[PDB]
């Protein structure tokens, strides 16, 4: 019935969301590394001053 | 009984996960602006040799 079907769809959302969390965390990590790289680049340029 | 309750459990678990996602989406967007910004700084540090 309606409660079974809902549970079915929700079980799916959960799986989707759990996977989405791990992917967004990896992505954050990759972005923070991109930031660090360039944050260092700036301190170098920032001394030729 | 067991079904009603499980349906409740699932509904919270989805809300909880939506918030983790939402937060991460905001962390990412923030990070994007910081990155755009400091990359703009670096443009100036390297090119405003006009000083």
């Amino acid at each position: 019935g309606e409660l079974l079907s809902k549970n079915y769809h929700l079980e799916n959302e959960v799986a989707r969301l759990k996977k989405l969390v791990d992917d967004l965390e990896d992505e954050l990590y990759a972005q923070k590394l991109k930031y660090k790289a360039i944050s260092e680049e700036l301190d170098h340029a920032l001394n030729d001053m | 009984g067991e079904l009603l309750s499980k349906n409740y459990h699932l509904e919270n678990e989805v809300a909880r996960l939506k918030k983790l996602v939402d937060d991460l989406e905001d962390e990412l967007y923030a990070q994007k602006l910081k990155y755009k910004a400091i990359s703009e700084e670096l443009d100036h540090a390297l090119n405003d040799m006009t000083s």
Binding site: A45, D48 | Y35, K36, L42, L46
Partner: protein
Amino acid sequence: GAASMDAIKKKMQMLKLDKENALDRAEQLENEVARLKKL
């Protein structure tokens, strides 16, 4: 993604050219001083 990354290294040796020539030119000014401090 945004801007220039190695065009960075392009105006970074071009900052090691307009400062390293700051003290080579802060040396020909000493040509009149190692010897001017002599007369």
